[PDB]
Design a protein around this motif. Structure first.
Motif, short mmCIF file in Angstrom:
data_model
loop_
_atom_site.label_atom_id
_atom_site.label_comp_id
_atom_site.label_asym_id
_atom_site.label_seq_id
_atom_site.Cartn_x
_atom_site.Cartn_y
_atom_site.Cartn_z
N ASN A 1 6.70 5.56 -2.43
CA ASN A 1 5.86 5.46 -3.62
C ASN A 1 6.41 4.65 -4.79
OD1 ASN A 1 3.33 7.03 -3.24
ND2 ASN A 1 4.76 8.69 -2.82
N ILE A 2 5.48 4.12 -5.57
CA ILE A 2 5.81 3.41 -6.80
C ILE A 2 5.29 4.45 -7.78
CG2 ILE A 2 5.32 1.50 -8.33
CD1 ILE A 2 4.54 -0.17 -5.99
N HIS B 1 5.16 -4.97 -5.61
CA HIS B 1 4.34 -4.88 -4.41
C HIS B 1 5.10 -4.72 -3.11
CE1 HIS B 1 5.49 -8.70 -2.67
NE2 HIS B 1 5.82 -8.97 -3.92
N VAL C 1 9.08 -4.40 -3.05
CA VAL C 1 9.76 -3.12 -2.87
C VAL C 1 9.28 -2.48 -1.57
CG1 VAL C 1 10.12 -2.72 -5.34
CG2 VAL C 1 8.00 -1.93 -4.25
N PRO C 2 10.15 -1.69 -0.92
CA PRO C 2 9.84 -1.00 0.35
C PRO C 2 9.00 0.26 0.18
CG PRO C 2 11.98 -0.34 -0.34
CD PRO C 2 11.55 -1.44 -1.32
N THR C 3 7.73 0.10 -0.14
CA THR C 3 6.84 1.23 -0.34
C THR C 3 5.60 1.09 0.54
OG1 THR C 3 5.75 0.08 -2.16
CG2 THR C 3 7.56 1.59 -2.72
N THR C 4 4.72 2.09 0.48
CA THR C 4 3.48 2.06 1.25
C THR C 4 2.60 0.89 0.83
OG1 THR C 4 2.41 3.57 -0.32
CG2 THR C 4 3.51 4.55 1.61
N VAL D 1 0.35 -0.06 -1.11
CA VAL D 1 -0.35 -0.05 -2.39
C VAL D 1 0.57 -0.74 -3.38
CG1 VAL D 1 -1.20 1.33 -4.29
CG2 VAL D 1 -1.67 2.04 -1.95
N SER D 2 0.04 -1.71 -4.11
CA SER D 2 0.83 -2.44 -5.09
C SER D 2 0.28 -2.24 -6.50
CB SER D 2 0.86 -3.93 -4.73
OG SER D 2 1.41 -4.11 -3.44
N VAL E 1 0.71 8.24 -8.22
CA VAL E 1 1.74 7.64 -7.39
C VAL E 1 0.94 6.61 -6.60
CG1 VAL E 1 3.19 9.68 -7.24
CG2 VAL E 1 1.33 9.37 -5.61
N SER E 2 1.55 5.46 -6.32
CA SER E 2 0.87 4.39 -5.60
C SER E 2 0.09 4.86 -4.37
CB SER E 2 1.89 3.31 -5.21
OG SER E 2 2.96 3.86 -4.46
N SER E 3 0.70 5.70 -3.54
CA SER E 3 0.05 6.18 -2.33
C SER E 3 -1.28 6.88 -2.54
CB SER E 3 0.98 7.13 -1.57
OG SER E 3 2.10 6.42 -1.06
#
Ligand SMILES: OC[C@H]1O[C@H](O)[C@H](O)[C@@H](O)[C@@H]1O
Ligand SMILES: OC[C@H]1O[C@H](O)[C@H](O)[C@@H](O)[C@@H]1O
Lengths: 309, 309
Positions: free
Chosen positions: A182-183, B176, B212-215, B217-218, B259-261
């Motif tokens: 998550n961001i 992102h 960045v290493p995230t799901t 969603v940016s 949270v982005s997710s």
């Protein structure tokens, strides 16, 4: 030549201890933490899940930590006031607990007999200082703060830019992993705090944050409105100059294509990233600066300790 | 009424098919991908590692793909110019390969018999359109671009703000995960591209990106200088109104802590985050907006397909 005691044996405390033990003119006399035993403290310091395995030799005697032959007293007092700082001749008590960060509370270390106190965290009441920004304004105060790792990354850059072109005002964003998938946005006082160490910028900077799941290196994204027109080359030159001078070890500079991890363990407070930044117009530019979440900051806590000594 | 062919069967191509198959006035007659077989295509569409297991029923006959009864021809031509677009009566060729994104290259689909082309990527030559920003300006052009997912997130916001308060100039940063343990900076033309769909803003917007290493969603971080003074509530009110009207499905709005997710699969082009943004002064504010890396964008692609038909 300067006796110090570290309160709190967390990520900061332990790193400060490591750094301090290397300062020829410092003598660590004690550490304190009420949640762990001397045996656990010795184990953690040696096999540090955060800072790695300590290269030196460590052991203890259920009463003192033994690092490379150097004995360091260990206590488990929940109230700093009962610590033998007076009896130990403690010149500076470094509190990295994050619970005795105000003047009233951090006063206990003074009552216990410690000459001065340095808080490894931002304070609402104690005077804050950032090495390379305003440590020269230290006027003998007994209780000081070193601000935060984020503020220590931003402030030096803000200083350089404001001194050379002037900052009308700026908006910051820090993308960090400061203590998955998550961001996560949140507010932060790190930008406003600059106004505390640089009075001339009071009320002229603020921002927010995005937490991301990366290694222990974060970044500052500063979008500023300049007073005087400037080219990106002039801006780069201004930073680079300072990074080659006396603030050599505080202000870093690069022009390469980097990844956050490249700076793991870096001791600079801020590393200016020339390539990452971008300027839209002569008075409107976005600047980028990296920072290890703890190494630059911790090295500055010790620097501040020796400066206030 | 509208017959379309999809070139490229990657992440976007497949989501575009899923969505197109659900539009009552769209007839998906074919797909093309020279790197995969009909067997593989079918297996990937049903058991999609990116978009999940397809709800409907899917099979094939070694020649066509069979989805919920509906039959879709499958080809494997490296040169779109050899495709049977004219024979199949293709009205619009959707190219999601990112390899035929210019007028001369995309022209190949037209040469093959397709009446029009929609590029699911930004183009240096093909005119770009962003639903919610300038699609009404479409004038019968035969080859168009839907810009990018980042531009589709920023542009709608930029328009709203520019229409209400006026943007003097702005600097964007997008954090992102667009296709480990690192924050990685890089350039991006996504901000500058807004100047293409909003000429009034040409040269007034640019920015950079942090991977960045995230799901999937940016987020876009827009620091903007306004022409007319405004309060954060007036800004919030302005975005909220647009998110309640006709652009309801394009512009999202929220005031919660997120949270982005929370936006995975969200189909809006952009979700304005009131709580995440922050304002320093009347004409200098930082706005935050979320966007799924593919869902909002792919939905617009189809919206644009039906619009240019
Ligand atoms: O390694 C540091 C120390 O960790 C703990 C052990 O009980 C002690 O015997 C050892 O010296
Ligand atoms: O028709 C269902 C399935 O049939 C078999 C094919 O190998 C597979 O790719 C397809 O999804």
């Amino acid at each position: 030549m300067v006796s110090i005691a570290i309160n709190g044996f967390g990520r900061i405390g332990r790193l400060v201890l490591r750094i301090a033990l290397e300062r020829k003119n410092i003598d660590v006399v004690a550490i304190n933490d009420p949640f762990i035993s001397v045996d656990y403290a010795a184990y953690m310091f040696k096999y540090d899940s955060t800072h790695g395995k300590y290269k030196g030799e460590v052991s203890h005697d259920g009463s003192n930590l033994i690092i490379n032959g150097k004995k360091v007293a260990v206590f488990q007092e929940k109230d700093p006031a009962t610590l033998p700082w007076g009896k130990l001749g403690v010149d500076i008590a470094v509190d990295s607990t994050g619970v005795f960060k105000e003047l009233d509370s951090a006063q206990k270390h003074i009552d216990a007999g410690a000459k001065k106190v340095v808080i490894t965290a931002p304070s609402k009441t104690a005077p804050m200082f950032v090495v390379g920004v305003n440590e020269d304004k230290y006027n003998g105060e007994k209780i000081v703060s070193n601000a935060s790792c984020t503020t220590n990354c931003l402030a030096p850059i803000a200083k350089i830019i404001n001194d050379e072109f002037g900052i009308e005002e700026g908006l910051m964003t820090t993308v960090h992993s400061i203590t998955s998938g998550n961001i996560i946005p949140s507010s932060t006082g790190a930008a406003k705090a600059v106004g505390k160490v640089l009075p001339e910028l009071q009320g002229k900077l603020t921002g927010m944050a995005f937490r991301v799941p990366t290694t222990d290196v974060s970044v500052v994204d500063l979008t500023v409105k300049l007073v005087k027109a400037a080219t990106y080359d002039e801006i780069k030159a201004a930073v680079k100059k300072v990074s080659e001078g006396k603030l050599k070890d505080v202000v870093g500079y690069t022009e390469d294509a980097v990844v956050s991890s490249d700076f793991l363990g870096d001791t600079h407070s801020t590393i200016f990233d020339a390539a990452a930044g971008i300027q839209l117009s002569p008075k409107f530019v976005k600047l980028v600066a990296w920072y290890d979440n703890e190494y630059g900051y911790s090295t500055r806590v010790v620097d501040l300790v020796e400066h206030v000594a």
